[PDB]
Write an enzyme that holds these catalytic residues in place. Sequence first.
Site, short mmCIF file in Angstrom:
data_model
loop_
_atom_site.label_atom_id
_atom_site.label_comp_id
_atom_site.label_asym_id
_atom_site.label_seq_id
_atom_site.Cartn_x
_atom_site.Cartn_y
_atom_site.Cartn_z
N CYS B 105 0.85 -1.19 0.00
CA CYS B 105 0.00 0.00 0.00
C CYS B 105 0.89 1.24 0.00
O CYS B 105 1.52 1.50 -1.06
CB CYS B 105 -1.02 -0.09 1.13
SG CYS B 105 -2.39 1.10 1.04
N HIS B 125 -0.26 1.37 -3.48
CA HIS B 125 -1.61 1.92 -3.62
C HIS B 125 -1.59 2.94 -4.74
O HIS B 125 -0.63 3.72 -4.85
CB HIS B 125 -2.03 2.61 -2.31
CG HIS B 125 -3.51 2.87 -2.32
ND1 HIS B 125 -4.07 3.99 -2.90
CD2 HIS B 125 -4.52 2.11 -1.84
CE1 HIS B 125 -5.37 3.88 -2.74
NE2 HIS B 125 -5.66 2.77 -2.12
#
Lengths: 187, 187
Positions: B105, B125
């Site tokens: 992420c 992400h």
Amino acid sequence: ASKRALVILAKGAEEMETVIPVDVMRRAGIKVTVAGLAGKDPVQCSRDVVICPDASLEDAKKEGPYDVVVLPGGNLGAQNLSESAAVKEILKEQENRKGLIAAICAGPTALLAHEIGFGSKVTTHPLAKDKMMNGGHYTYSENRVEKDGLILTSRGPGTSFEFALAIVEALNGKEVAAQVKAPLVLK
Amino acid sequence: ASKRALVILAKGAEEMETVIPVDVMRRAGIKVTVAGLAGKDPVQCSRDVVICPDASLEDAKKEGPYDVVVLPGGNLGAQNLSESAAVKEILKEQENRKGLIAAICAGPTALLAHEIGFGSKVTTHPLAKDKMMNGGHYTYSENRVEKDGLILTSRGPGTSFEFALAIVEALNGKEVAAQVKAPLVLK
């Protein structure tokens, strides 16, 4: 106008099934109380993650009612939930006020223990089906998330996002759930 | 005999991206150390879940090395990882010894801060892509899980199971990862 959730955290709870709903619900603007069954002490989960509750269940009860009561799974956690008279009373009151009850994996077996929602269609983890179906007090479903009125159930760690989002949608509607979902990078 | 994993837990870490890999790896028989960047004290995560680490990072360093070092995301968590000399030390040592480094992420932005794996193909992400690509030190990927040698990256909470199972497969092989996967009820 914020909706409110009570998540009941017992020793042996499945930590993924606890944290995914808490996090996703908070992302939705739901005010979530992680309530320790046993008191305010840290809780050792099923794979030994240690989570500190926000409050004891006794203190959290005084701050309700809640728009949803959530029961994580884990076999020891569900056993602990199922043996608790305190849990019994919160679930009865929640059914009696027509509030949502949501349980995942082994968690629905506490509904059986406490005689909650008899006659509902429910799902569980496959390995918890036999226990849930003892006495024939429910109808079984293989859906990943199953909702029968105010009884919302789901199957396992890998259905936890789906379960959490179903709770969000029930409380805050489809657009809030969709808006929370998109940054998660779900498939 | 058991493989060993270090999961570094900083204030502001994404609690789902912490707990899903810890739990899945422990299901696979990996010995996981949850190490608090800031010491043994409880850690307040991005959506306010509080997790008690197993050890301080200072002790975990001494107790290493590890078959995998795991960096969760969360933007504050990743920032704290990025600003830690201790994290730097651990990552450089892991890189030197040809051990796996896994980041999800916003987590991979700590690789950038500590100059780890430059020239690798990586994912993050979507909202962390800008940061990660500043200066052109990596090649970007939109795969849910990306692996370039010992640099294993992934994109978000909803890729955490795939990320964790990729770590399991790398350490313990395909049959262990499949066996761990089946009871999770993933789709």
